[PDB]
Scaffold this active site. Structure first.
Site, PDB file in Angstrom:
ATOM      1  N   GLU A  11      -6.545 -12.925 -15.864  1.00 12.06           N
ATOM      2  CA  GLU A  11      -6.307 -12.044 -17.005  1.00 12.06           C
ATOM      3  C   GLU A  11      -5.777 -12.759 -18.236  1.00 12.06           C
ATOM      4  OE1 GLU A  11      -7.236  -8.926 -17.053  1.00 12.06           O
ATOM      5  OE2 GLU A  11      -7.631  -8.662 -14.910  1.00 12.06           O
ATOM      6  N   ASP A  20     -10.298  -5.711 -24.161  1.00 17.71           N
ATOM      7  CA  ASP A  20     -10.784  -6.308 -22.926  1.00 17.71           C
ATOM      8  C   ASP A  20     -12.299  -6.488 -23.000  1.00 17.71           C
ATOM      9  OD1 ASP A  20     -11.916  -3.828 -22.250  1.00 17.71           O
ATOM     10  OD2 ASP A  20     -10.635  -3.506 -20.514  1.00 17.71           O
ATOM     11  N   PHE A 104      -6.982  -3.904  -9.234  1.00 20.83           N
ATOM     12  CA  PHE A 104      -6.352  -4.113 -10.534  1.00 20.83           C
ATOM     13  C   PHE A 104      -7.386  -4.045 -11.652  1.00 20.83           C
ATOM     14  CE2 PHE A 104      -2.657  -5.996 -12.805  1.00 20.83           C
ATOM     15  CZ  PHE A 104      -3.269  -6.452 -13.955  1.00 20.83           C
ATOM     16  N   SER A 115     -19.773  -2.807   1.093  1.00 21.42           N
ATOM     17  CA  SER A 115     -18.996  -4.042   1.075  1.00 21.42           C
ATOM     18  C   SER A 115     -17.725  -3.894   1.895  1.00 21.42           C
ATOM     19  CB  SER A 115     -18.626  -4.424  -0.357  1.00 21.42           C
ATOM     20  OG  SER A 115     -19.772  -4.572  -1.179  1.00 21.42           O
TER      21      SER A 115
END
Ligand code: YGM
EC number: 3.2.1.17
Length: 160
Positions: A11, A20, A104, A115
């Site tokens: 990040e 972002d 997150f 998955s």
């Protein structure tokens, strides 16, 4: 290596409001402020989160405290989710970091049913292939590759 070092790598750290990769107002170590296009809305969210009038700027200490809260919230979203918790509990400590990392970035709700099953079954190469067939991988491929390598190998090799 631990979840804090891992997400700090992924990040970065910025002390002023930024956008972002999806164009959303963010601050600190990847703390999402709002999906609204209004910078004023983002600034209001920031002041509420920090508890003072920030004028769009925070200190490193404040960024790190927000980051602790956000990592905690990701863990709790896993532990409260009946689909995520059993898979998370089945993982070793390094792969648990990869799981927290995804939550997150995309949120506990934010299509990985197949998955998850492969991860619970410890079919690591198959899970890695399935995880890459995603908007996530296509839009942030370098970060997704690091996270997937962590799930595939159970090592920190992608971060080292
Ligand atoms: C890999 C898919 C979603 C992230 C995750 C994985 C395993 C356990 C909890 C969350």
């Amino acid at each position: 290596m631990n979840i804090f070092e891992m997400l700090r790598i992924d990040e970065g750290l910025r002390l002023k409001i930024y956008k972002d990769t999806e164009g959303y107002y963010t601050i600190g170590i990847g703390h999402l402020l709002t999906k609204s296009p209004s910078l004023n809305a983002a600034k209001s969210e920031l002041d509420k989160a920090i508890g003072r009038n920030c004028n769009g700027v925070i200190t490193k200490d404040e960024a790190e405290k927000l980051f602790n809260q956000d990592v905690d919230a990701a863990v709790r979203g896993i532990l409260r989710n009946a689909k995520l918790k059993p898979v998370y509990d089945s993982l070793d400590a390094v792969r648990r970091c990869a799981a927290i990392n995804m939550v997150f970035q995309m949120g506990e709700t934010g299509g990985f049913t197949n998955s998850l099953r492969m991860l619970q079954q410890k079919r690591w190469d198959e899970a890695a292939v399935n995880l890459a067939k995603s908007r996530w991988y296509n839009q942030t491929p370098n970060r997704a590759k690091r996270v997937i390598t962590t799930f595939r190998t159970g090592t920190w090799d992608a971060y080292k």
